[PDB]
């Protein structure tokens, strides 16, 4: 366990939530991972370094870095804490534009279609696929297990391409049933 460092730049729009949640962020990093934590106000970036004397798990530093990065992308804190707890969680990212070139009102409606009324359509996908989805404007991030995220990506892509929410919701129930079977 050698002396190493990591830096993750928090965007302006997320740091106040970092201020909002940081009381619950440094404890797990410092006690469990034995990680020495700091963030530079001047650069507005979190600085993580491995302390050779106390830190023991070689993957601790990278685990913490992804944990903040999970928080940075917009995921809620407890959703990100799962990353620290587990080892097989990854984040999938892509734009709507790769799926389809949508602009103006077409783009806005596509984002609305994914979220659904009161976020129900997004709440549909998250539970069935056992993942979390962040709809950051035209930017989509999915957190979960590798196999899990791929089902989630498919349903989201189907909505972007124009599949109405109802047929997507029906398919979610089908795959949701198969998840319980296995």
């Amino acid at each position: 366990i050698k002396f190493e460092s990591r830096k993750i730049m928090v965007p302006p729009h997320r740091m106040t939530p970092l201020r909002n949640s940081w009381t619950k962020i440094y404890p797990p990093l410092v006690e469990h991972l034995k990680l020495q934590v700091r963030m530079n106000l001047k650069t507005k970036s979190v600085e993580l370094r491995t302390n050779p004397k106390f830190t023991t798990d070689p993957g601790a530093l990278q685990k913490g870095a992804d944990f903040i990065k999970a928080f940075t992308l917009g995921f809620d804190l407890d959703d990100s804490i799962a990353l620290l707890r587990l080892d097989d969680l990854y984040i999938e990212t892509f734009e709507v534009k790769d799926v389809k070139t949508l602009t103006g009102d077409h783009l806005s409606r596509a984002i609305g279609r994914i979220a659904g009324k009161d976020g129900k359509t997004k709440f549909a996908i998250e539970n069935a696929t056992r993942t979390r989805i962040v709809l950051a404007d035209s930017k989509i991030h999915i957190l979960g297990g590798f196999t899990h995220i791929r089902m989630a990506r498919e349903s989201v892509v189907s909505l972007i391409l124009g599949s109405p929410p109802g047929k997507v919701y029906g398919n979610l129930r089908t795959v949701a049933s198969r998840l319980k079977e296995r």
Partner: peptide
Amino acid sequence: LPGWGEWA
């Protein structure tokens, strides 16, 4: 807030 601007 312990370590907001200093190493903690």
